[PDB]
Amino acid sequence: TCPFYKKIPGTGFTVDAFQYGVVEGCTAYFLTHFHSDHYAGLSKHFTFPVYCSEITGNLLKNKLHVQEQYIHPLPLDTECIVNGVKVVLLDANHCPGAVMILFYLPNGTVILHTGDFRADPSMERSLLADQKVHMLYLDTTYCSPEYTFPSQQEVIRFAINTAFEAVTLNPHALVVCGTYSIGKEKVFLAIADVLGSKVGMSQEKYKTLQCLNIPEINSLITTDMCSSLVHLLPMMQINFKGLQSHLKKCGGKYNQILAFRPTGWTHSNKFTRIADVIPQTKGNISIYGIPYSEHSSYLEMKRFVQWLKPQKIIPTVNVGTWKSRSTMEKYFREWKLEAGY
Numbered sequence: 607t608c609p610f611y612k613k614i615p616g617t618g619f620t621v622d623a624f625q626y627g628v629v630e631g632c633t634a635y636f637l638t639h640f641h642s643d644h645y646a647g648l649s650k651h652f653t654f655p656v657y658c659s660e661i662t663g664n665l666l667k668n669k670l671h672v673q674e675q676y677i678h679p680l681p682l683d684t685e686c687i688v689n690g691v692k693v694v695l696l697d698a699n700h701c702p703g704a705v706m707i708l709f710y711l712p713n714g715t716v717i718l719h720t721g722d723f724r725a726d727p728s729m730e731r732s733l734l735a736d737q738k739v740h741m742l743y744l745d746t747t748y749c750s751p752e753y754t755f756p757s758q759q760e761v762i763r764f765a766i767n768t769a770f771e772a773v774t775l776n777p778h779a780l781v782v783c784g785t786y787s788i789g790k791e792k793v794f795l796a797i798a799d800v801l802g803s804k805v806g807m808s809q810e811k812y813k814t815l816q817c818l819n820i821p822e823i824n825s826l827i828t829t830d831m832c833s834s835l836v837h838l839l840p841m842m843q844i845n846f847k848g849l850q851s852h853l854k855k856c857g858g859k860y861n862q863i864l865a866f867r868p869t870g871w872t873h874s875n876k877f878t879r880i881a882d883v884i885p886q887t888k889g890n891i892s893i894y895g896i897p898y899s900e901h902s903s904y905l906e907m908k909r910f911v912q913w914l915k916p917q918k919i920i921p922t923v924n925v926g927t928w929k930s931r932s933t934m935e936k937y938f939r940e941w942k943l944e945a946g947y
């Protein structure tokens with residue numbers, strides 16, 4: 607049944623709650639972003655109002671065939687009324703189109719649902735600064751102090767310098783980048799930019815990217831694989847067998863692959879600096895696992911919450927085990943006692 611942490615009290619609203627059938631007493635279904643654990647259940651057969659960003663609404667229409675009359679896109683950073691309740695959508699610094707939602711309840715309570723987010727100090731100067739938030743529904747994906755990672759900027763710099771060096775040493779090398787959902791577009795776009803190439807990809811992935819309002823996108827991507835030296839493939843194919851196979855397909859145009867797998871966190875972070883990352887190599891194939899995250903680190907999450915000072919926190923991630931829930935609650939109390947709220 608629909609869990610309590612997907613329901614907004616004092617409203618008829620749910621958030622990311624599309625896989626439970628008709629939720630009793632739900633008058634509006636919000637969708638924070640286009641990732642499958644969140645949209646699971648949507649299709650052309652859905653007949654309730656869906657509230658979301660413009661970008662997410664482009665993806666619902668084009669990829670899932672949801673009928674236009676049920677899609678209600680909202681502008682960001684703008685006070686809107688939905689079924690008699692004031693709401694605001696804010697940038698979540700996750701994947702394209704991803705939002706946090708501010709609810710202003712009729713009784714005076716203010717609720718922030720982060721959806722999935724990567725906290726950033728820029729959030730401390732949005733519409734969030736202008737009033738108090740009483741309850742926080744929090745993306746706790748990496749809520750434990752072992753989760754450190756570098757900035758997105760440091761990671762992109764590493765990937766650009768690596769790719770540029772390899773291809774300038776060997777003009778017959780191919781660069782490959784893995785993907786399985788929207789997000790992390792900067793990885794493949796920044797590499798193709800430094801190399802003076804478009805990124806080549808399947809028709810289905812090209813379609814997905816054409817829904818994202820990225821500036822100058824027609825200049826950066828293509829379905830012509832032959833004219834490209836940066837290819838995108840399914841994340842599943844980023845292994846020595848899948849890459850050897852791909853290289854056969856290219857018809858002797860290339861004699862080396864350098865591949866990137868942009869994971870979330872991996873335990874080499876506890877020890878290793880970004881400067882110090884090395885690939886796994888077999889023959890003329892090298893694979894780099896790079897820690898490009900679109901979720902908060904523990905320290906980023908902690909700073910955001912200690913700035914906001916909510917009266918009550920409701921975790922949305924890692925809620926399935928008692929040991930996880932109890933550990934998260936302990937961190938929340940530490941944070942509150944250190945900061946004094």
Ligand code: NI
Pocket residue numbers: 639641700722
């Ligand atoms: Ni997500």
